[PDB]
Amino acid sequence: AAGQGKAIKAIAGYSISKWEASSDAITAKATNAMSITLPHELSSEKNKELKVGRVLLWLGLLPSVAGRIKACVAEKQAQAEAAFQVALAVADSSKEVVAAMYTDAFRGATLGDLLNLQIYLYASEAVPAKAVVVHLEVEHVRPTFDDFFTPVYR
Amino acid sequence: AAGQGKAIKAIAGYSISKWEASSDAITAKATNAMSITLPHELSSEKNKELKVGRVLLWLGLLPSVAGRIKACVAEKQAQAEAAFQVALAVADSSKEVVAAMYTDAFRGATLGDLLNLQIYLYASEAVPAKAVVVHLEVEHVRPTFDDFFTPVYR
Amino acid sequence: AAGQGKAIKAIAGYSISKWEASSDAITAKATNAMSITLPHELSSEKNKELKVGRVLLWLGLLPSVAGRIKACVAEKQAQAEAAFQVALAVADSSKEVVAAMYTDAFRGATLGDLLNLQIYLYASEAVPAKAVVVHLEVEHVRPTFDDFFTPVYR
Amino acid sequence: AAGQGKAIKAIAGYSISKWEASSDAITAKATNAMSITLPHELSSEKNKELKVGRVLLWLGLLPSVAGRIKACVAEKQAQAEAAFQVALAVADSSKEVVAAMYTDAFRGATLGDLLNLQIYLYASEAVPAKAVVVHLEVEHVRPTFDDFFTPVYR
Amino acid sequence: AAGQGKAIKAIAGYSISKWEASSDAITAKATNAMSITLPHELSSEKNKELKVGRVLLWLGLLPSVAGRIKACVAEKQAQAEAAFQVALAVADSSKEVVAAMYTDAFRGATLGDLLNLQIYLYASEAVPAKAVVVHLEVEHVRPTFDDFFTPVYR
Amino acid sequence: AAGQGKAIKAIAGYSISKWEASSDAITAKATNAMSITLPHELSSEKNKELKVGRVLLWLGLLPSVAGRIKACVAEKQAQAEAAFQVALAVADSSKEVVAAMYTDAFRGATLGDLLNLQIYLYASEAVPAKAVVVHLEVEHVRPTFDDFFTPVYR
Amino acid sequence: AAGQGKAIKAIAGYSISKWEASSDAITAKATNAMSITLPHELSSEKNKELKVGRVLLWLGLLPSVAGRIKACVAEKQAQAEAAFQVALAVADSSKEVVAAMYTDAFRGATLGDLLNLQIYLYASEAVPAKAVVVHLEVEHVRPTFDDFFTPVYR
Amino acid sequence: AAGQGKAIKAIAGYSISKWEASSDAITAKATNAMSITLPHELSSEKNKELKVGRVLLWLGLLPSVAGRIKACVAEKQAQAEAAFQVALAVADSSKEVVAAMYTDAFRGATLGDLLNLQIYLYASEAVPAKAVVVHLEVEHVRPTFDDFFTPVYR
Amino acid sequence: AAGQGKAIKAIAGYSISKWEASSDAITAKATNAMSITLPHELSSEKNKELKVGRVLLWLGLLPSVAGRIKACVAEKQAQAEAAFQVALAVADSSKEVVAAMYTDAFRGATLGDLLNLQIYLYASEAVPAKAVVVHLEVEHVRPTFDDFFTPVYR
Amino acid sequence: AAGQGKAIKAIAGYSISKWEASSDAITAKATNAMSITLPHELSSEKNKELKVGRVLLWLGLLPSVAGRIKACVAEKQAQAEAAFQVALAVADSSKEVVAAMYTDAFRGATLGDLLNLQIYLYASEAVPAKAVVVHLEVEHVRPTFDDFFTPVYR
Amino acid sequence: AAGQGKAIKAIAGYSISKWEASSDAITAKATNAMSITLPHELSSEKNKELKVGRVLLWLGLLPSVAGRIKACVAEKQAQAEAAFQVALAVADSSKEVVAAMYTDAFRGATLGDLLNLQIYLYASEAVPAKAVVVHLEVEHVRPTFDDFFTPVYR
Amino acid sequence: AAGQGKAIKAIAGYSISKWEASSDAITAKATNAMSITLPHELSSEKNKELKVGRVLLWLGLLPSVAGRIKACVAEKQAQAEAAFQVALAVADSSKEVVAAMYTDAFRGATLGDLLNLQIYLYASEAVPAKAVVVHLEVEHVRPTFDDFFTPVYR
């Protein structure tokens, strides 16, 4: 078999941009709602229009962090709590795999649209700030690079 | 990863209609029994006769919802509790995957027949109303659209 | 040919949505100006962007309705009367065929743009309300349907 | 540059049954509503399920019949007058061609369903009974005939 | 190559019309002579000229009917009794197979000619009326159906 | 070319279900009318819709049974006696072959329709109950069997 | 690839019979031992000799049923408890998949042999009767159907 | 056909063993039940397992034997008389052909099984012993013969 | 036959320029004579020499405009009235199609020549100014575009 | 293609000569009868023998000309009025198309024969002279041109 | 689709020998160390040299056995406890799959070498003797069988 | 068509070096940070430059070790605790599989670079020294061997 000695590969023409975001303190049963921030290289107008494919979200916690942590990506919610009822995937620290793979939830959208989305983060017990790092990995159309110099020479 | 990366795709000629339904409060060990309601676009007579393929059911809970939730789709039962003994699949919040995929349970039936089915929902502890959203996804034959204008020009 | 025992067919990839609108009373020589309202199924954002092809407009009158009725589709006019001077087609009750087939007038536009258009309706004599039904048939790109279930199975 | 000495021909597998119905006296501006009666040979159960294709309706009037006659086929109406506002075709004595060709209005239905339809007939002036014959021509799937003798030589 | 569970099939282009006729009381040794009556659908002039192939005749008696019954088809006879001496086949209740198959007796003739023929029915003992049903099955050229609508347009 | 040592075989896709029914006492010249009862395995809804082909009926009598026995299958009759006048085949104990083979009488119908039929049984003399066994053999479309295990291994 | 939206299919020539059995009350730490009962259609001698392939066993429990349930299929045991030490598979309610798939344990045996086997059912706590339904699914060689009528027509 | 001067031939690999059995006196309306006895050559163990195909039974009576004789082969009956109601074929002296050809009744069984069958013989009048010879002809798989000498000369 | 949903297409190499002109008041039975004015883009010398193909002229009137309107294109006339006696086509408001298609009248001429032509417009009753819009559609050789930049870099 | 974008073309070898003729005053209900005059170029003997194909006649009226005009081409008539009863085509100002196309009326004849024909022109009301121009278009064999200079040498 | 319905198959040339061993009482936190004993058929010298492939070890416990059991195969250890720190696989009762598959740990070794290995068995709580059966399955090269009879014929 | 009977294999040209490291006592909630030490054979300069592929890390614990252990490989950290928030994989004793497979984290790096990495090891409860063995398996380019002798022979 090809087993899990191989990572999941991006589709032709796309590449994967990965970045993280540190949590803010969170009180028991609360649900913070941090927002997505594109990495500088992708903030240009030319790029904010690159089409998205799959999106992965996983958590990095301090070994000490006790309790249960859940997270997900969804559009701005009237009620934070509610995000988890409509999100198409949820990273949950109590499961074997603590990750959320959005296979089609944002396929077709473009970077930038990601800016209108939010990352809801819940904790069953009080958790210090910076105690949870939220990793985000976005598969998107590969950005294009300049192939010509400025036409200086007359 | 290598666990997947791709969603399960519909068969040729079919498409997937998805819709949800919010729960009503539910007391410890109880088993409510809400019923299936087709989306308006599928309520026409022409459509209520489209053949069903696979059916998927999953749950969206508030992070806070404690206890164990189980749900399933089966025919009207004399005893709610009993649905879980004959249902060919059960969505269970304590498992890795909280979903129920009915591969052949309703294959061949038609929308509308779905109206005579029910969604049984159990909870091991008291649960507020609206605390559980039941998502239902039905793979059915794709409906037909008009290819001709009214023959006006004589 | 030897005659038309066949209706005019929608081009490949498109389908035809048909709907109607009832008239409001109209006084002799007057020109009412009702507006286009997309059918619910087509009001979604995803759909309001489907491209239009041909558009057909025809009238259904009570047998009793005396006088002459004329109708057409054009952009909002400063002067109702004037619509008929620029409309590329006019349904006129006095002709053999009381219909207006806009072959290219709106080709390329999208549903929704149709919301900024108007249906001008003129009558040479007084006409009760509901005495004229305006049938509208729009050929547009066929809307898309979901082909994948939600990725649940890990 | 084609021709007009050829009638419109039934599609493969179908044939055309024709029959008529005489009118009842009708008062000025009135709208009688006679109903469809299948010919005896088509009243069997085996036949009442043969699928319909196109349907043609034309009028035969006495030369003397003055005024304007209109007719059409539509489902039972709350208001007779209104049939003409929704009918997909109308036979009108004032036009060049006094006939109504329903190209798809009943395509797919079956004989017998035709029994639930009605023929609305309007006259702008008083018209004696029997002064108008309503011809109806239905293209339907060709009925099957017995190919075997009763098995007696056994 | 096995048994014989197949009925005798009509030749290409032909079909088989079947109909019956009830008997009138008949006294011992008497010979009634009922006449052939085409079924309504075949009474038209167009049809009365369809060519005949084979003709079969069989009897349906009440279980009680005692005695011997004989029947046949032949031209009008000066003497009823005599029909049986020239008929090319006779249905006889005392035989294994109570039927008469006229293979060529009327081949070539046409329906209608059948009107000039008679069905002689003999009984060795008194028999109540309606106690014998005479079944007649005629293989004839398949009647033609209309492939064209009235050239109503032009 | 001999005498036939082969039974008549079912058509491709069909199989033959056989079952019997014991008679009730029957008085001289009387005609009892027992009804068809499908075998349990065929009583399901899925099966009651399997299309019928040929049907065979034969009788098993006690050696002692004297007199003449006749039987047949036909639709419910106003008059039992009359069944024999319209039945397309009759099993008669006085013939060489005491059986009735309905080659097309029920071809096309489905099991269950058979429930609306009857078995008329006549005797010329008094006959004890259970003295006649009526064998029925129906050729019908072969039922379908489950090819998949319940998808438990999610 | 990435998904389980298809059930496990029976091998060529085999089909899957499914049936259930309700439990009897069971006291804490006890191990009941119900026995296999073939469905009526499979009780014939012809069938009790059909060869077995794979055998699947799964449990249906009332949502309320607390504690741990284990079940399995093995030959009659001197000591019920011991069945679980030799059974080649065990359905255990505490696992993700509560089922037991005997891939080769009974391959080669025949139905009927299954009659000499037993279903051992253990519970860690007291359980009411009928609170556990034991589903059994046997893949076996497809039974044969009659292809010939009785040889009546000599 | 055009060749009734040929007997029915055994299928490839099989041969036909024929033997007889003389009757015992039989009183009016009685039904004796003699049993099948394989011929010595077929009594070995190796042979009693040869598979059977078709079985024919015919009667040889003294010219004088008056009355009606009936015979058949069926499994041991509680009531002799009853054999004739279930036997799939009956030799009857009053018919044209006094024989019973069991086409499939015992196909598949093996010689020896024939030992558990019986020959029921009925007579409408008193019949002396030895007045009826019952011929039995069994088509079975051809027995094998020894091709090697004992390896004495070693 | 279908295709009544297609506009007449411009020949290879040509395109269609469309523009309008508003009428000036016109007194009963009078005949105004406005002149053709090329659109700015076509006024260049390079363009005024593009060859013309077909020319179409149609009218846009206020619904209210009563009376009869006629129009046409012809060379400057000594007598306006007379234009209509020599024009090869006339747009007439009383006809089914109110348009004038000059198929060859100006084929071969060039834009600019069109400047020496006139549009004669007649009205049977007084008509306000701006009450009639005269649409003019000219099929002409597609103008050529510049393919080189100015030669500066030399 | 679209009969409204293309004119009717002459057949191979032929060309079309067109010319007109002005009317003379005409009194109500009267029928003038002007005659055909070939154009000078066609008056030569060589030409007056060129064979004719189709002939078209259409009218050019002053906008003012009220009433109904009819015209046609036929042989000299004893009674002008009568021309219209035998002419194979009539130009009638009250129709959609005011033209008369003689498809075969003069096919075969030659120019010059046209000199023996007449143009009958009727008016329902008084009409000034010159108020109606009669256009005549004759398709005839193409005259031949001189290919040689005058031999002025040796 | 290649694992839950199919068992893991031995490689070409190898077969799988399976056998078990019963446990000895074990005290809380203790670690017994039983040894491997080849089955008699494999104890010959010829066999003790057959090469090993994969080795599987799984456990069969009484349903009652509470606590946590762990087991594994490793070389004789100075400290039993330590076996678990170097074993390449461990069967642990607390996991979903209680088995240890040594894919290459002993590949290349031979039976007999297995005699120098040990099975370490740990329990978190006291466990009666015989309460745990240790199943061992060894894939090894298929032994050779005798192909010749002793040569007694000189 | 089997399952989990194979081990993940090194890519072409690479091989896998495995070695271990014993832990040092660790206090509750503490996180020790041992460092990577290449095996002697890999310490040469020639080798320290061999490129790495995948890296696997798994734990071997004493059965007694209670509490939760977590481990991972990452670059030297300012804060030990933090390693677990950025490591791309973590071996966690509470999961089903206690291992960490770094698929690409160090792909491309070289042995030696591994020397600048660290193994962070956390424990939720106090753990004796040597109680945890950390297994490390590195897939790297296969080192080369000497193919020549020293050229001593001139």
Distance between CA atoms of A135 and A116, rounded to whole angstroms?
A: 18
Strand I52-61 relative to strand L91-92, pairing:
unpaired
Paired strand residues for F19: F136
G151 touches chain C (CB under 8 A): no
Q: Give contacts of C153 with chain G, Cβ < 8 Å.
A: 3-5
Q: Choose the mutation target among L85, L103, L124 for the interface with A, i.e. most A CBs under 10 Å.
A: L85
| Residue G66: both structure tokens together | 């607390």
Q: Give contacts of I7 with chain C, Cβ < 8 Å.
A: 103-104
Query: K73: Cβ–Cβ under 8 A, 6 or more apart, which residues?
Result: K36, K55, K57, K87, K100, K102, K105, K106, K117, K118, K119, K120, K136
Instruction: State the Cα torsion D70-D76-D79-D84 to the nearest 10°.
Output: -30
Closest CA to A38 of A133, A103, A111: A111
What is the residue whose two structure tokens read 């034997």?
H65
Resolution in Å, one decimal place? 2.9
Tell me the Ramachandran region of residue I3: left when phi exceeds 0, alpha when psi lies from -120 to 50, beta otherwise.
Answer: left
Paired strand residues for H86: none
Distance between CA atoms of E129 and E26, rounded to whole angstroms?
A: 7
| Residue A17: both structure tokens together | 């941009």
* Burial of residue E85 (number of CB atoms within 10 Å: 0-12, 13-18, 19+): exposed
CATH number for the domain spanning L74: value is 2.60.120.220
C99 touches chain D (CB under 8 A): no
Report how far apart, in Å, the C-alpha atoms of L82 and of each of A135, I144, L68, L126 are. 14, 70, 17, 20
Name the structure determination technique.
X-ray
By Cβ distance, the residue of J63, J96, J132 closest to I95 is J96
Continuous segment of H or E residues that includes residue G74: strand G69-75
C145 touches chain G (CB under 8 A): no
By Cβ distance, the residue of I1, I7, I63 closest to C103 is I7
Closest CA to D71 of D140, D112, D37, D117: D117
10 Å Cβ neighbour count for I119? 20
Contact G84 K96 (CB under 8 A): no
Continuous segment of H or E residues that includes residue L35: strand L31-35
Contact D97 B154 (CB under 8 A): yes
Closest CA to G80 of G125, G38, G33, G42: G33
| Residue C22: both structure tokens together | 């009832």
Main-chain dihedrals φ then ψ at residue F77, nearest 5 degrees? -110, 145
Strand D132-141 relative to strand D52-61, pairing:
antiparallel
Distance between CA atoms of E76 and E118, rounded to whole angstroms?
A: 6
B11 touches chain G (CB under 8 A): no
What is the residue whose two structure tokens read 């109606």?
J132
Strand F132-141 relative to strand F52-61, pairing:
antiparallel
10 Å Cβ neighbour count for E135? 20
**Residues 26-85, chain A, touching L (beta carbon < 8 A):** 60-64
Q: List the beta strands (DSSP E) in C9-141.
A: 14-22, 31-35, 52-61, 69-75, 91-92, 99-102, 117-123, 132-141
Residue J74 and residue J86 in contact, taking contact as beta carbons nearer than 8 Å = yes
Contact I86 J5 (CB under 8 A): no
**Residues 101-120, chain L, touching A (beta carbon < 8 A):** 101, 103-104
Enumerate helices (H) and strands (E) in chain K, giving the number of each.
1, 8
Contact E149 C4 (CB under 8 A): no
Q: Choose the mutation target among H8, H57, H103 for the interface with G, i.e. most G CBs under 10 Å.
A: H103
Closest CA in chain J for residue I4: J2
Residue D51 and residue D109 in contact, taking contact as beta carbons nearer than 8 Å = yes
Continuous segment of H or E residues that includes residue B69: strand B69-75
Q: How many domains does chain F have?
A: 1
B9 touches chain A (CB under 8 A): no
Query: A41: Cβ–Cβ under 8 A, 6 or more apart, which residues?
Result: A47, A143
Q: List the beta strands (DSSP E) in K14-126.
A: 14-22, 31-35, 52-61, 69-75, 91-92, 99-102, 117-123
The radius of gyration of chain H from alpha carbons, rounded to an integer in Å, stands at 18
Strands of the J132-141 sheet, one edge to the other: J14-22, J132-141, J52-61, J99-102
Residue G143 and residue G110 in contact, taking contact as beta carbons nearer than 8 Å = no
| Residue F74: both structure tokens together | 């036909």
Paired strand residues for C140: C15, C52
How far is the alpha carbon of D148 from chain F, nearest alpha carbon, in Å? 9
Strand H91-92 relative to strand H69-75, pairing:
antiparallel
Distance between CA atoms of I14 and I107, rounded to whole angstroms?
A: 12
Distance between CA atoms of J1 and I153, rounded to whole angstroms?
A: 51
- 3-state class of G105 per DSSP? coil
How far is the alpha carbon of C48 from chain A, nearest alpha carbon, in Å? 17
Main-chain dihedrals φ then ψ at residue F66, nearest 5 degrees? -100, 170
Closest CA to A3 of C149, B98, L97, K99: L97
Distance between CA atoms of I98 and I92, rounded to whole angstroms?
A: 5
Main-chain dihedrals φ then ψ at residue C76, nearest 5 degrees? -50, 130
Contact I6 J2 (CB under 8 A): yes
Instruction: State the Cα torsion A70-A71-A72-A78 to the nearest 10°.
Output: 90
Contact L62 K85 (CB under 8 A): yes
Closest CA in chain H for residue G148: H104
- 3-state class of E60 per DSSP? strand
What is the residue whose two structure tokens read 């990839």?
C13
Q: Give contacts of C64 with chain D, Cβ < 8 Å.
A: 29, 81
Instruction: Spell out where chain B is interrupted, by the residue before each break (C to N > 2.5 A).
Output: none
How far is the alpha carbon of H81 from chain F, nearest alpha carbon, in Å? 6
Closest CA to F133 of E1, A2, H87: H87
Evaluate the CA torsion angle H7, H86, F97, E56 in order and state its sign.
Answer: negative
Instruction: State the Cα torsion K105-K111-K117-K122 to the nearest 10°.
Output: 80
| Residue E71: both structure tokens together | 């029947």
Distance between CA atoms of J49 and C139, rounded to whole angstroms?
A: 58
- Residue K34: HSE in the Cβ half-sphere, 13 Å Cα cutoff: 20
Q: Give contacts of D2 with chain C, Cβ < 8 Å.
A: 1-2
Report how far apart, in Å, the C-alpha atoms of F132 and of each of B76, E103, F92, H69 are. 46, 39, 13, 19
| Residue E118: both structure tokens together | 């008679």
Distance between CA atoms of I89 and I102, rounded to whole angstroms?
A: 6
How many interchain CB pairs under 8 A, I with J?
Answer: 37
Domain hosting I85: range is 1-154
Residue C61 and residue C128 in contact, taking contact as beta carbons nearer than 8 Å = no
- Residue A145: HSE in the Cβ half-sphere, 13 Å Cα cutoff: 2
Strand B14-22 relative to strand A69-75, pairing:
unpaired
| Residue F120: both structure tokens together | 């008329």
Main-chain dihedrals φ then ψ at residue D86, nearest 5 degrees? -120, -15
Q: How far apart are the first and last CA of chain G?
A: 61
What is the residue whose two structure tokens read 């079985």?
H55
Q: In three state form, how does the secondary structure of chain I look?
A: CCCCCCCCCCCCCEEEEEEEEECCCECCCCEEEEECCCCHHHCCCCCCCCEEEEEEEEEEECCCCCCCEEEEEEECCCCHHHHHHHCCCCEECCCCCCEEEECCCCCCCECCHHHHEEEEEEECCCECCCCEEEEEEEEEECCCCCCCCCCCCC
